[PDB]
Tab-separated table of C-alpha atoms and ligand atoms in Angstrom:
chain	number	residue	atom	x	y	z
A	1	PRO	CA	-23.369	-2.082	-19.533
A	2	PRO	CA	-25.196	-0.202	-21.129
A	3	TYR	CA	-23.981	2.920	-19.312
A	4	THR	CA	-25.943	6.142	-18.936
A	5	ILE	CA	-24.665	9.257	-17.150
A	6	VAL	CA	-27.423	11.709	-16.029
A	7	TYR	CA	-25.925	15.109	-15.132
A	8	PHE	CA	-25.931	18.877	-15.562
A	9	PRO	CA	-24.096	20.278	-18.644
A	10	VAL	CA	-20.737	20.766	-16.839
A	11	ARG	CA	-17.626	18.622	-16.400
A	12	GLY	CA	-17.687	18.790	-12.599
A	13	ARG	CA	-17.912	15.473	-10.858
A	14	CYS	CA	-18.452	13.466	-14.069
A	15	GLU	CA	-15.364	14.225	-16.214
A	16	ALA	CA	-13.146	11.605	-14.478
A	17	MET	CA	-15.688	8.813	-15.066
A	18	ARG	CA	-16.153	9.979	-18.706
A	19	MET	CA	-12.338	9.834	-19.259
A	20	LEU	CA	-12.191	6.365	-17.620
A	21	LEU	CA	-14.986	5.044	-19.890
A	22	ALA	CA	-13.381	6.621	-22.973
A	23	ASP	CA	-9.916	5.256	-22.194
A	24	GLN	CA	-11.420	1.796	-21.591
A	25	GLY	CA	-13.139	1.859	-24.998
A	26	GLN	CA	-16.657	1.917	-23.572
A	27	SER	CA	-19.462	3.937	-25.006
A	28	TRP	CA	-22.187	5.504	-22.781
A	29	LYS	CA	-25.410	7.535	-23.213
A	30	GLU	CA	-25.267	11.082	-21.853
A	31	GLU	CA	-28.580	12.301	-20.363
A	32	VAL	CA	-28.064	16.081	-19.876
A	33	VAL	CA	-30.325	17.838	-17.365
A	34	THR	CA	-30.645	21.574	-17.880
A	35	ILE	CA	-31.142	23.891	-14.871
A	36	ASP	CA	-34.693	24.729	-16.054
A	37	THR	CA	-35.541	21.015	-16.031
A	38	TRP	CA	-33.938	20.483	-12.593
A	39	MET	CA	-35.816	23.472	-11.200
A	40	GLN	CA	-39.149	21.878	-12.293
A	41	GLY	CA	-38.625	19.517	-9.344
A	42	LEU	CA	-39.703	16.161	-10.900
A	43	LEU	CA	-36.238	14.636	-11.213
A	44	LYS	CA	-34.725	15.646	-7.814
A	45	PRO	CA	-37.217	13.742	-5.529
A	46	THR	CA	-36.487	10.498	-7.434
A	47	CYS	CA	-32.735	10.868	-6.793
A	48	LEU	CA	-31.599	8.999	-3.643
A	49	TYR	CA	-29.701	11.898	-2.073
A	50	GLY	CA	-31.621	14.471	-4.247
A	51	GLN	CA	-28.428	15.195	-6.280
A	52	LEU	CA	-26.748	14.271	-9.538
A	53	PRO	CA	-24.698	12.363	-10.943
A	54	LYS	CA	-27.035	9.469	-11.477
A	55	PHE	CA	-25.458	6.529	-13.325
A	56	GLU	CA	-27.055	3.469	-14.865
A	57	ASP	CA	-25.188	0.363	-15.630
A	58	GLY	CA	-27.899	-1.732	-17.191
A	59	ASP	CA	-29.848	-3.005	-14.275
A	60	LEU	CA	-28.003	-0.984	-11.593
A	61	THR	CA	-28.705	2.661	-10.844
A	62	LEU	CA	-26.088	4.378	-8.685
A	63	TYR	CA	-25.602	7.790	-7.121
A	64	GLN	CA	-22.436	9.390	-5.664
A	65	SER	CA	-19.703	10.037	-8.229
A	66	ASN	CA	-16.938	8.229	-6.211
A	67	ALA	CA	-19.207	5.175	-5.715
A	68	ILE	CA	-19.714	5.176	-9.514
A	69	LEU	CA	-15.925	5.544	-9.997
A	70	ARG	CA	-15.138	2.658	-7.566
A	71	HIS	CA	-17.836	0.565	-9.285
A	72	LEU	CA	-16.218	1.112	-12.717
A	73	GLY	CA	-12.778	0.410	-11.147
A	74	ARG	CA	-14.040	-2.854	-9.659
A	75	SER	CA	-15.998	-4.049	-12.662
A	76	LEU	CA	-13.498	-2.987	-15.389
A	77	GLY	CA	-10.444	-4.318	-13.467
A	78	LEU	CA	-8.951	-0.912	-12.526
A	79	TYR	CA	-8.664	-1.444	-8.759
A	80	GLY	CA	-5.252	-2.966	-8.276
A	81	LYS	CA	-4.068	-6.508	-8.210
A	82	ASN	CA	-4.354	-7.043	-4.458
A	83	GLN	CA	-5.788	-5.646	-1.206
A	84	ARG	CA	-2.761	-3.470	-0.349
A	85	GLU	CA	-3.060	-1.732	-3.708
A	86	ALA	CA	-6.826	-1.298	-3.383
A	87	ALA	CA	-6.356	0.176	0.124
A	88	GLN	CA	-3.851	2.671	-1.274
A	89	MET	CA	-6.088	3.539	-4.233
A	90	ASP	CA	-8.824	4.398	-1.740
A	91	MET	CA	-6.416	6.590	0.306
A	92	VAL	CA	-5.455	8.375	-2.935
A	93	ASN	CA	-9.058	8.839	-4.172
A	94	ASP	CA	-10.139	10.121	-0.749
A	95	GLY	CA	-7.292	12.703	-0.762
A	96	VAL	CA	-8.395	13.703	-4.290
A	97	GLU	CA	-11.970	14.116	-3.116
A	98	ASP	CA	-10.884	16.324	-0.156
A	99	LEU	CA	-9.084	18.805	-2.427
A	100	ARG	CA	-12.008	18.627	-4.948
A	101	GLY	CA	-14.304	19.576	-2.031
A	102	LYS	CA	-12.148	22.687	-1.371
A	103	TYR	CA	-11.991	23.530	-5.092
A	104	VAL	CA	-15.834	23.384	-5.404
A	105	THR	CA	-16.256	25.658	-2.369
A	106	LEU	CA	-13.712	28.155	-3.856
A	107	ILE	CA	-15.403	28.247	-7.262
A	108	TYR	CA	-18.960	28.524	-6.077
A	109	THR	CA	-18.696	30.310	-2.674
A	110	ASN	CA	-15.642	32.591	-2.742
A	111	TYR	CA	-13.932	32.778	-6.118
A	112	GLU	CA	-13.085	36.481	-6.084
A	113	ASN	CA	-11.742	36.841	-2.541
A	114	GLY	CA	-10.520	33.285	-1.840
A	115	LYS	CA	-8.626	32.637	-5.096
A	116	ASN	CA	-5.195	34.034	-4.109
A	117	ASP	CA	-5.306	32.312	-0.694
A	118	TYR	CA	-6.340	29.006	-2.271
A	119	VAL	CA	-3.581	29.154	-4.857
A	120	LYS	CA	-1.026	30.067	-2.191
A	121	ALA	CA	-2.033	27.055	-0.112
A	122	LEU	CA	-2.207	24.751	-3.142
A	123	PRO	CA	1.451	23.416	-3.066
A	124	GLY	CA	0.885	21.968	0.425
A	125	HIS	CA	-2.142	20.120	-0.957
A	126	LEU	CA	-0.348	18.854	-4.102
A	127	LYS	CA	2.713	17.696	-2.226
A	128	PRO	CA	1.086	14.337	-0.979
A	129	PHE	CA	0.549	13.266	-4.586
A	130	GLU	CA	4.120	14.115	-5.571
A	131	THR	CA	5.328	12.082	-2.557
A	132	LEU	CA	3.162	9.108	-3.608
A	133	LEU	CA	4.517	9.190	-7.183
A	134	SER	CA	8.168	9.335	-6.074
A	135	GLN	CA	7.499	6.326	-3.881
A	136	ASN	CA	6.096	4.345	-6.806
A	137	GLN	CA	8.737	3.458	-9.362
A	138	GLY	CA	10.177	6.941	-9.164
A	139	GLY	CA	6.999	8.457	-10.602
A	140	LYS	CA	7.303	6.625	-13.904
A	141	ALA	CA	4.134	4.536	-13.665
A	142	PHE	CA	0.700	5.172	-12.139
A	143	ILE	CA	-0.252	6.650	-8.762
A	144	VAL	CA	-0.581	3.192	-7.221
A	145	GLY	CA	1.182	0.278	-8.960
A	146	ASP	CA	2.036	-0.535	-12.545
A	147	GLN	CA	-1.477	-0.312	-14.005
A	148	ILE	CA	-4.000	2.509	-14.328
A	149	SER	CA	-6.824	2.668	-11.747
A	150	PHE	CA	-10.010	4.664	-11.179
A	151	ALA	CA	-7.871	6.847	-8.866
A	152	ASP	CA	-5.570	7.951	-11.719
A	153	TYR	CA	-8.505	9.229	-13.748
A	154	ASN	CA	-9.845	11.181	-10.784
A	155	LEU	CA	-6.391	12.633	-9.927
A	156	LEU	CA	-5.691	13.614	-13.589
A	157	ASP	CA	-8.993	15.510	-13.766
A	158	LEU	CA	-8.228	17.259	-10.477
A	159	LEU	CA	-4.824	18.360	-11.789
A	160	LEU	CA	-6.140	19.399	-15.211
A	161	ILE	CA	-8.670	21.827	-13.640
A	162	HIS	CA	-6.048	23.142	-11.189
A	163	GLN	CA	-3.826	24.039	-14.122
A	164	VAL	CA	-6.704	26.111	-15.567
A	165	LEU	CA	-7.094	27.791	-12.153
A	166	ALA	CA	-3.376	28.384	-11.519
A	167	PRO	CA	-1.314	27.811	-14.681
A	168	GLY	CA	2.040	27.190	-13.054
A	169	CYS	CA	0.815	25.168	-10.037
A	170	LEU	CA	2.750	22.065	-11.144
A	171	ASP	CA	6.056	23.868	-11.969
A	172	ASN	CA	7.701	22.779	-8.741
A	173	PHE	CA	6.208	19.245	-8.939
A	174	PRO	CA	8.157	17.460	-11.692
A	175	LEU	CA	6.648	14.016	-11.225
A	176	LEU	CA	3.118	15.407	-11.277
A	177	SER	CA	3.842	17.551	-14.421
A	178	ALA	CA	5.274	14.538	-16.182
A	179	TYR	CA	2.398	12.318	-14.931
A	180	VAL	CA	-0.192	14.778	-16.321
A	181	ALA	CA	1.647	14.943	-19.656
A	182	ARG	CA	2.021	11.168	-19.794
A	183	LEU	CA	-1.587	10.274	-19.026
A	184	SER	CA	-3.075	13.006	-21.189
A	185	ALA	CA	-1.101	11.551	-24.117
A	186	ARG	CA	-2.822	8.157	-23.859
A	187	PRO	CA	-4.554	7.801	-27.277
A	188	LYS	CA	-8.122	7.532	-26.055
A	189	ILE	CA	-7.762	10.238	-23.356
A	190	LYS	CA	-6.073	12.612	-25.858
A	191	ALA	CA	-8.986	11.932	-28.251
A	192	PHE	CA	-11.589	12.472	-25.490
A	193	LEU	CA	-9.949	15.714	-24.402
A	194	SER	CA	-10.124	17.043	-27.954
A	195	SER	CA	-13.741	15.963	-28.494
A	196	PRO	CA	-16.352	18.773	-28.982
A	197	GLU	CA	-18.500	17.200	-26.197
A	198	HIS	CA	-15.624	17.646	-23.741
A	199	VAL	CA	-14.452	20.939	-25.187
A	200	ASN	CA	-17.856	22.638	-25.288
A	201	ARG	CA	-18.650	21.543	-21.756
A	202	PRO	CA	-17.885	24.171	-19.043
A	203	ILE	CA	-15.796	22.955	-16.080
A	204	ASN	CA	-18.160	24.405	-13.533
A	205	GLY	CA	-21.753	25.667	-13.730
A	206	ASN	CA	-21.220	29.317	-12.713
A	207	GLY	CA	-18.738	30.339	-15.451
A	208	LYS	CA	-15.733	30.359	-13.095
A	209	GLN	CA	-12.640	28.212	-13.514
B	1	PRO	CA	-2.518	-7.384	12.171
B	2	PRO	CA	-1.183	-5.887	14.478
B	3	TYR	CA	-3.760	-3.042	14.307
B	4	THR	CA	-2.849	0.429	15.633
B	5	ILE	CA	-5.067	3.560	15.437
B	6	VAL	CA	-3.280	6.892	15.877
B	7	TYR	CA	-5.822	9.575	16.692
B	8	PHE	CA	-6.718	12.451	18.921
B	9	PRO	CA	-8.509	11.388	22.192
B	10	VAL	CA	-12.048	11.879	20.667
B	11	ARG	CA	-14.556	9.519	19.025
B	12	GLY	CA	-14.748	11.528	15.807
B	13	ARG	CA	-13.768	9.612	12.661
B	14	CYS	CA	-12.481	6.527	14.526
B	15	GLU	CA	-15.457	5.244	16.546
B	16	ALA	CA	-16.987	3.395	13.554
B	17	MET	CA	-13.751	1.468	12.842
B	18	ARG	CA	-13.359	0.743	16.595
B	19	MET	CA	-16.891	-0.753	16.673
B	20	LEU	CA	-16.105	-2.764	13.487
B	21	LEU	CA	-12.950	-4.221	15.045
B	22	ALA	CA	-14.664	-4.945	18.397
B	23	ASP	CA	-17.609	-6.625	16.661
B	24	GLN	CA	-15.284	-8.733	14.523
B	25	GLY	CA	-13.431	-9.875	17.650
B	26	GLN	CA	-10.193	-7.992	16.881
B	27	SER	CA	-7.903	-6.268	19.290
B	28	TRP	CA	-5.991	-3.115	18.428
B	29	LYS	CA	-3.718	-0.596	20.016
B	30	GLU	CA	-4.593	3.040	20.609
B	31	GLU	CA	-1.775	5.517	20.122
B	32	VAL	CA	-3.306	8.739	21.509
B	33	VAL	CA	-1.978	12.073	20.200
B	34	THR	CA	-2.869	15.014	22.409
B	35	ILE	CA	-3.756	18.385	20.915
B	36	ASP	CA	-0.798	19.963	22.732
B	37	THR	CA	1.634	17.416	21.189
B	38	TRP	CA	-0.003	17.980	17.779
B	39	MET	CA	0.427	21.738	18.039
B	40	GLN	CA	4.177	21.289	18.535
B	41	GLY	CA	4.038	20.482	14.773
B	42	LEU	CA	6.395	17.490	14.707
B	43	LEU	CA	4.023	14.621	13.832
B	44	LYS	CA	1.876	16.562	11.333
B	45	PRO	CA	4.600	16.706	8.543
B	46	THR	CA	4.914	12.904	8.673
B	47	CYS	CA	1.180	12.394	7.981
B	48	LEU	CA	0.509	12.028	4.224
B	49	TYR	CA	-2.245	14.641	4.217
B	50	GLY	CA	-1.026	16.301	7.444
B	51	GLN	CA	-4.015	14.817	9.316
B	52	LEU	CA	-5.112	11.956	11.557
B	53	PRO	CA	-6.477	9.173	11.759
B	54	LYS	CA	-3.422	7.127	10.873
B	55	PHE	CA	-3.952	3.384	10.933
B	56	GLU	CA	-1.405	0.570	10.921
B	57	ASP	CA	-2.195	-2.884	9.790
B	58	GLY	CA	0.986	-4.931	10.096
B	59	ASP	CA	3.316	-3.229	7.629
B	60	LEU	CA	0.633	-1.227	5.786
B	61	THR	CA	0.139	2.322	7.022
B	62	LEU	CA	-3.099	4.078	5.970
B	63	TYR	CA	-4.576	7.565	6.252
B	64	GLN	CA	-8.184	8.692	5.477
B	65	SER	CA	-10.890	7.261	7.671
B	66	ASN	CA	-12.999	5.887	4.804
B	67	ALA	CA	-9.983	4.193	3.122
B	68	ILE	CA	-9.261	2.536	6.503
B	69	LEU	CA	-12.907	1.377	6.823
B	70	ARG	CA	-13.002	0.060	3.236
B	71	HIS	CA	-9.743	-1.729	3.872
B	72	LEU	CA	-11.039	-3.433	7.020
B	73	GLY	CA	-14.290	-4.201	5.131
B	74	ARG	CA	-12.319	-5.862	2.325
B	75	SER	CA	-9.855	-7.761	4.529
B	76	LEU	CA	-12.443	-8.972	7.022
B	77	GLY	CA	-15.166	-9.879	4.522
B	78	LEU	CA	-17.537	-7.025	5.297
B	79	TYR	CA	-18.016	-5.788	1.726
B	80	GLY	CA	-20.885	-7.881	0.331
B	81	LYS	CA	-21.260	-11.069	-1.656
B	82	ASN	CA	-20.796	-9.507	-5.101
B	83	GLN	CA	-20.089	-6.380	-7.114
B	84	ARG	CA	-23.660	-5.096	-7.068
B	85	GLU	CA	-23.696	-5.128	-3.257
B	86	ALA	CA	-20.210	-3.601	-3.089
B	87	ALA	CA	-21.299	-0.614	-5.256
B	88	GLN	CA	-24.420	-0.163	-3.118
B	89	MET	CA	-22.362	-0.217	0.094
B	90	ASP	CA	-20.106	2.490	-1.359
B	91	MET	CA	-23.149	4.603	-2.307
B	92	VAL	CA	-24.436	4.203	1.273
B	93	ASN	CA	-21.053	5.060	2.848
B	94	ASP	CA	-20.528	8.111	0.583
B	95	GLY	CA	-24.012	9.343	1.665
B	96	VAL	CA	-22.957	8.831	5.333
B	97	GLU	CA	-19.710	10.770	4.653
B	98	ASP	CA	-21.632	13.677	3.170
B	99	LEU	CA	-23.775	14.045	6.249
B	100	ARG	CA	-20.776	13.491	8.600
B	101	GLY	CA	-18.972	16.339	6.790
B	102	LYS	CA	-21.987	18.588	7.413
B	103	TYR	CA	-22.119	17.525	11.063
B	104	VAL	CA	-18.404	18.320	11.506
B	105	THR	CA	-18.881	21.800	10.035
B	106	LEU	CA	-21.775	22.461	12.428
B	107	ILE	CA	-19.887	21.267	15.472
B	108	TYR	CA	-16.598	23.010	14.891
B	109	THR	CA	-17.516	26.179	13.085
B	110	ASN	CA	-21.189	27.144	13.660
B	111	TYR	CA	-22.810	25.280	16.498
B	112	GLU	CA	-24.619	27.998	18.466
B	113	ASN	CA	-25.930	29.751	15.375
B	114	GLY	CA	-26.473	26.763	13.051
B	115	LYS	CA	-27.924	24.021	15.275
B	116	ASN	CA	-31.631	24.790	14.884
B	117	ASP	CA	-31.359	25.053	11.079
B	118	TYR	CA	-29.354	21.780	10.912
B	119	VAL	CA	-31.874	19.899	13.004
B	120	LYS	CA	-34.748	21.289	10.867
B	121	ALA	CA	-32.925	20.096	7.737
B	122	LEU	CA	-31.930	16.731	9.236
B	123	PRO	CA	-35.140	14.646	8.385
B	124	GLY	CA	-34.530	15.303	4.680
B	125	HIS	CA	-31.003	13.978	5.170
B	126	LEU	CA	-32.119	10.829	7.024
B	127	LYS	CA	-34.946	9.828	4.701
B	128	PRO	CA	-32.581	8.156	2.054
B	129	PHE	CA	-31.303	5.690	4.655
B	130	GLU	CA	-34.856	4.890	5.702
B	131	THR	CA	-35.753	4.228	2.045
B	132	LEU	CA	-32.666	2.053	1.449
B	133	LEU	CA	-33.579	-0.002	4.501
B	134	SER	CA	-37.227	-0.424	3.423
B	135	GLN	CA	-36.060	-1.799	0.088
B	136	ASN	CA	-33.641	-4.230	1.724
B	137	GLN	CA	-35.973	-6.972	3.118
B	138	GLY	CA	-38.421	-4.441	4.562
B	139	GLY	CA	-35.683	-3.132	6.852
B	140	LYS	CA	-35.282	-6.216	8.991
B	141	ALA	CA	-31.626	-6.978	8.025
B	142	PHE	CA	-28.613	-4.661	7.305
B	143	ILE	CA	-28.352	-1.536	5.109
B	144	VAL	CA	-27.270	-3.577	2.053
B	145	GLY	CA	-27.638	-7.351	1.758
B	146	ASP	CA	-28.143	-9.731	4.605
B	147	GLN	CA	-24.665	-9.578	6.129
B	148	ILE	CA	-23.187	-6.659	8.104
B	149	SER	CA	-20.628	-4.563	6.205
B	150	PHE	CA	-18.291	-1.649	6.894
B	151	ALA	CA	-21.111	0.774	5.884
B	152	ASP	CA	-23.383	-0.463	8.724
B	153	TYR	CA	-20.812	0.552	11.345
B	154	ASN	CA	-20.290	3.959	9.785
B	155	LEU	CA	-24.079	4.529	9.490
B	156	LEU	CA	-24.645	3.261	13.081
B	157	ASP	CA	-22.046	5.717	14.410
B	158	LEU	CA	-23.575	8.617	12.399
B	159	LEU	CA	-27.081	7.946	13.800
B	160	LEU	CA	-25.799	7.480	17.377
B	161	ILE	CA	-24.077	10.917	17.454
B	162	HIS	CA	-27.177	12.472	15.796
B	163	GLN	CA	-29.353	11.097	18.580
B	164	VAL	CA	-27.124	13.077	20.976
B	165	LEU	CA	-27.289	16.242	18.904
B	166	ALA	CA	-31.057	15.958	18.279
B	167	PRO	CA	-32.725	13.520	20.725
B	168	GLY	CA	-35.724	12.038	18.986
B	169	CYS	CA	-34.512	12.742	15.414
B	170	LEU	CA	-35.319	9.070	14.612
B	171	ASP	CA	-38.924	9.312	15.920
B	172	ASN	CA	-40.355	9.546	12.418
B	173	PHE	CA	-38.006	6.837	11.100
B	174	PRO	CA	-39.298	3.489	12.472
B	175	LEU	CA	-36.887	1.324	10.489
B	176	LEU	CA	-33.772	3.404	11.390
B	177	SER	CA	-34.861	3.327	15.060
B	178	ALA	CA	-35.250	-0.461	14.967
B	179	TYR	CA	-31.972	-0.725	13.070
B	180	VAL	CA	-29.982	1.327	15.661
B	181	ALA	CA	-31.547	-0.737	18.399
B	182	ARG	CA	-30.771	-4.059	16.700
B	183	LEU	CA	-27.143	-3.297	15.852
B	184	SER	CA	-26.487	-1.675	19.273
B	185	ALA	CA	-27.678	-4.878	20.962
B	186	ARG	CA	-25.075	-7.024	19.127
B	187	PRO	CA	-23.170	-8.326	22.211
B	188	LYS	CA	-19.722	-7.159	21.132
B	189	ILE	CA	-21.041	-3.708	20.110
B	190	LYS	CA	-23.081	-3.597	23.356
B	191	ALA	CA	-19.878	-4.282	25.298
B	192	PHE	CA	-17.949	-1.630	23.350
B	193	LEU	CA	-20.636	1.012	23.807
B	194	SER	CA	-20.677	0.628	27.577
B	195	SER	CA	-16.890	0.314	27.923
B	196	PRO	CA	-15.322	3.244	29.934
B	197	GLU	CA	-12.816	3.714	27.061
B	198	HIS	CA	-15.691	4.584	24.762
B	199	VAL	CA	-17.858	6.341	27.344
B	200	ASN	CA	-15.132	8.604	28.647
B	201	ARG	CA	-13.908	9.582	25.209
B	202	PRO	CA	-15.681	12.797	23.992
B	203	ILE	CA	-17.580	12.634	20.671
B	204	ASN	CA	-15.749	15.664	19.287
B	205	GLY	CA	-12.634	17.700	20.129
B	206	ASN	CA	-14.268	21.024	21.016
B	207	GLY	CA	-16.624	20.072	23.828
B	208	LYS	CA	-19.756	20.368	21.614
B	209	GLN	CA	-22.034	17.486	20.687
C	1	GTX	C1	-25.794	23.994	-12.473
C	1	GTX	C2	-24.628	23.065	-12.809
C	1	GTX	C3	-23.553	23.149	-11.757
C	1	GTX	C4	-23.851	22.429	-10.465
C	1	GTX	C5	-23.146	21.096	-10.518
C	1	GTX	C6	-22.532	20.786	-9.158
C	1	GTX	S1	-22.410	19.012	-8.789
C	1	GTX	C7	-24.221	18.983	-8.642
C	1	GTX	C8	-24.801	18.660	-7.276
C	1	GTX	N1	-24.411	17.335	-6.846
C	1	GTX	C9	-23.425	17.097	-5.997
C	1	GTX	O1	-22.787	17.967	-5.408
C	1	GTX	C10	-23.211	15.625	-5.761
C	1	GTX	C11	-22.250	15.306	-4.639
C	1	GTX	C12	-22.141	13.799	-4.373
C	1	GTX	N2	-21.420	13.584	-3.164
C	1	GTX	C13	-21.292	13.085	-5.413
C	1	GTX	O2	-20.088	12.891	-5.203
C	1	GTX	O3	-21.855	12.671	-6.419
C	1	GTX	C14	-26.301	18.655	-7.411
C	1	GTX	O4	-26.855	17.641	-7.831
C	1	GTX	N3	-26.941	19.766	-7.082
C	1	GTX	C15	-28.360	19.893	-7.304
C	1	GTX	C16	-29.080	20.143	-6.001
C	1	GTX	O5	-28.489	19.919	-4.937
C	1	GTX	O6	-30.224	20.579	-6.064
C	2	GTX	C1	-8.357	19.277	16.515
C	2	GTX	C2	-8.835	18.364	17.665
C	2	GTX	C3	-10.134	17.626	17.384
C	2	GTX	C4	-10.155	17.163	15.951
C	2	GTX	C5	-10.912	15.884	15.724
C	2	GTX	C6	-11.364	15.843	14.260
C	2	GTX	S1	-10.323	14.846	13.176
C	2	GTX	C7	-8.990	16.042	12.966
C	2	GTX	C8	-8.519	16.386	11.571
C	2	GTX	N1	-8.620	15.287	10.618
C	2	GTX	C9	-9.524	15.225	9.636
C	2	GTX	O1	-10.350	16.113	9.397
C	2	GTX	C10	-9.434	13.998	8.757
C	2	GTX	C11	-10.361	14.031	7.533
C	2	GTX	C12	-9.944	12.959	6.537
C	2	GTX	N2	-10.660	13.081	5.305
C	2	GTX	C13	-10.379	11.583	7.005
C	2	GTX	O2	-11.492	11.142	6.686
C	2	GTX	O3	-9.537	10.910	7.575
C	2	GTX	C14	-7.038	16.671	11.761
C	2	GTX	O4	-6.207	15.760	11.665
C	2	GTX	N3	-6.734	17.905	12.116
C	2	GTX	C15	-5.388	18.280	12.452
C	2	GTX	C16	-4.918	19.329	11.481
C	2	GTX	O5	-5.554	19.556	10.450
C	2	GTX	O6	-3.910	19.950	11.761
């Protein structure tokens, strides 16, 4: 530490790392970049892939939100107890990222016309996660193993925004509904989710959700 | 071990992990799924995300090409000397994945009409890797640290298929050109790249490259 998140004023790709830091009792500095500032073009050319999030952990500057998430998993001890678990956490986080990729394209490229087709195809995309939970202690623990990982925080965020998009999407997925309820109730996540910083922040930049 | 890769008969998302295994002196089995068998629809429901590659390592079954690569990186000691390196290698590999995703979209959905635009945009996408390399020992070693890692194989594969798509795209990138040349001359990669198995396998599934 110290931790600094540099990002646009939206939840987007930074709300899972914010929830992880909050639930682990860490504090961080939030460096908000407004669109006017981004459009001035001084910040972008200093960013490795010209995009945000940018994260600082003391000495180390990182880019790519999943690299930042895996870094926090590795350094805060949220990456499983052994290689098999870590391999499975990666498979989970990668599946999360694929659906987050589709969600971002719906929101920003085709909200109006794509929405009903997205939501109709959503159960087939949520089913893998329900299968993984049943296979792990009947869905009563975390997505991989007995302890929380970086992957849980990223999956919870993905499910929380899909419930805003399609309110009953978890009605036929009992283990995922219970998982969402369970993890949201964790004292420090529950507190973070009720914080004005989280609440005043839009999910996406274009007003859709 | 044993190692088994279950994939379509194309290079696609499995040629980087094949080069990694070959260079680390491992043997593996290829279970080839043809497109006509896949379209019968019997194997797809058994895949966690309905997709291939599927990888078997002894009794661990994995899906997601980057989870498989990170797994091999972790089990074979190709993930750096410390946490700082490990985070940097993930940042590199997520940057490779972003460009691979763009490449896939070009190839399968918009080749004839998007190629010129892609190639014009490509220098701005390769410049980060050139910069990373110049900061790591003036580009004479690997992408991160002084030992090869899973990210080097994924980056090498990305640049090799881009040299097919846009011959001479590395002309303005002296360090990436020297890098490709250096890693391609590693005797076990050199053997793999001239093997008929590799040579006769198409880069992509739709005849474009
Ligand atoms: C206006 C607020 C809403 C937009 C927020 C969308 S995420 C922002 C976008 N960055 C990314 O898409 C980063 C993707 C990267 N792969 C990651 O995982 O971190 C960006 O920096 N875009 C700036 C650019 O490309 O110029
Ligand atoms: C189609 C013939 C040529 C395709 C070669 C490209 S890989 C095929 C595609 N798989 C993927 O896109 C996997 C992406 C996944 N994120 C990964 O990294 O493993 C698939 O299984 N597609 C089958 C499906 O979706 O039904």
